[PDB]
C-alpha cells in the first residue's frame, strides 16, 4: 500500500498486487457497510417555516 496524499477528510493510496474481487469488496464495504450515526426521528413543535 503506497499512500500518495492523506489529509483531513481525504485519502489516496495504492494497492499493488491485489485482484479486483478483494478491491471491489473494500470499495463496497466503504460505501455501504461501514456504519455511522445519523438522525432518524424528529420531534416537531411549531415549525412555522
Amino acid at each position: 500500500v503506497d499512500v500518495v496524499h492523506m489529509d483531513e477528510n481525504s485519502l489516496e493510496f495504492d494497492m499493488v498486487g491485489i485482484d479486483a474481487a478483494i478491491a471491489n469488496a473494500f470499495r463496497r464495504i466503504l460505501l455501504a457497510e461501514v456504519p455511522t450515526m445519523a438522525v432518524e426521528k424528529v420531534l416537531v413543535y411549531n415549525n412555522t417555516s
Binding site: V4, H5, F13, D14
Partner: protein, 51 residues
C-alpha cells in the same frame, strides 16, 4: 337657361398622385446572420485524475 346637350368627349385624363419614388433603397437590407457558436477562450482541463 335651356342647357342643351353637347358631343361625345374624346379622352378622359385621370389625375392621380405619383408613385412613391426613392422609398426603397437600391441595395437590400437583410437581418444579419446569427453567428456560428465559438469555442470560448480560456478552456483548460480542470479535472485531475484522483490519486
Amino acid at each position: 337657361g335651356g342647357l342643351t346637350c353637347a358631343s361625345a368627349p374624346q379622352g378622359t385624363l385621370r389625375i392621380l398622385e405619383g408613385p412613391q419614388q426613392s422609398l426603397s433603397g437600391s441595395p437590400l437590407q437583410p437581418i444579419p446572420a446569427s453567428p456560428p457558436p465559438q469555442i470560448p477562450p480560456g478552456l483548460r482541463p480542470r479535472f485531475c485524475a484522483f490519486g
